[PDB]
Write a protein that binds this ligand. Structure first.
Ligand code: A1IDG
Length: 149
């Protein structure tokens, strides 16, 4: 679960959850199901608290979304501290960007949404991957902290 493949699937699962397009074969993992729950809760909070801010930007391509996402990541982790709450926050932001991109993309390609999932997993992997592993990974760190009590 420290690998890219795992984090990519978590980011793509979150996207399909936001887009209301779930895959039929089996469904998401307990880990993804716990994540979609806590990340959606955060996303709605960020949507309300950042209302004015969001309604001003225009996400017209995957490249425009990569830039906005990097900008948000730059200010989310500027103090250098990582915690599960901030990791959940990354997922919430890709959800905000996919909603905006569905609404404002110049060439509405359906194969662009999986590119968001790619640069989200790349960011998580390269910038928080080590912290995640040392804190228990997804199945012994994230789930144990956020699964229903
Ligand atoms: C409204 C401020 C701004 O221009 N930001 C750009 C932005 C990036 C990503 C998303 Cl999902 C919406 C808007 C901005 C917002 C929040 C930040 F933490 C940094 C930059």
């Amino acid at each position: 679960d420290c690998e890219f493949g795992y984090i990519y699937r978590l980011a793509q699962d979150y996207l399909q959850c936001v887009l209301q397009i779930p895959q039929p074969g089996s469904g998401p993992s307990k880990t993804s199901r716990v994540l979609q729950n806590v990340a959606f809760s955060v996303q709605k909070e960020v949507e309300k608290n950042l209302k004015s801010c969001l309604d001003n930007v225009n996400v017209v391509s995957v490249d425009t979304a990569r830039t906005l996402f990097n900008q948000v990541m730059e200010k989310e982790f500027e103090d250098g501290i990582i915690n599960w709450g901030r990791i959940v926050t990354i997922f919430a932001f890709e959800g905000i960007l996919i909603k905006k991109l569905l609404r404002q993309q110049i060439a509405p390609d359906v194969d662009t949404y999986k590119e968001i999932s790619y640069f989200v997993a790349e960011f998580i992997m390269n910038n928080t991957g080590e912290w995640i592993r040392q804190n228990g990974g997804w199945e012994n760190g994230f789930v144990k902290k956020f699964e229903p009590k």
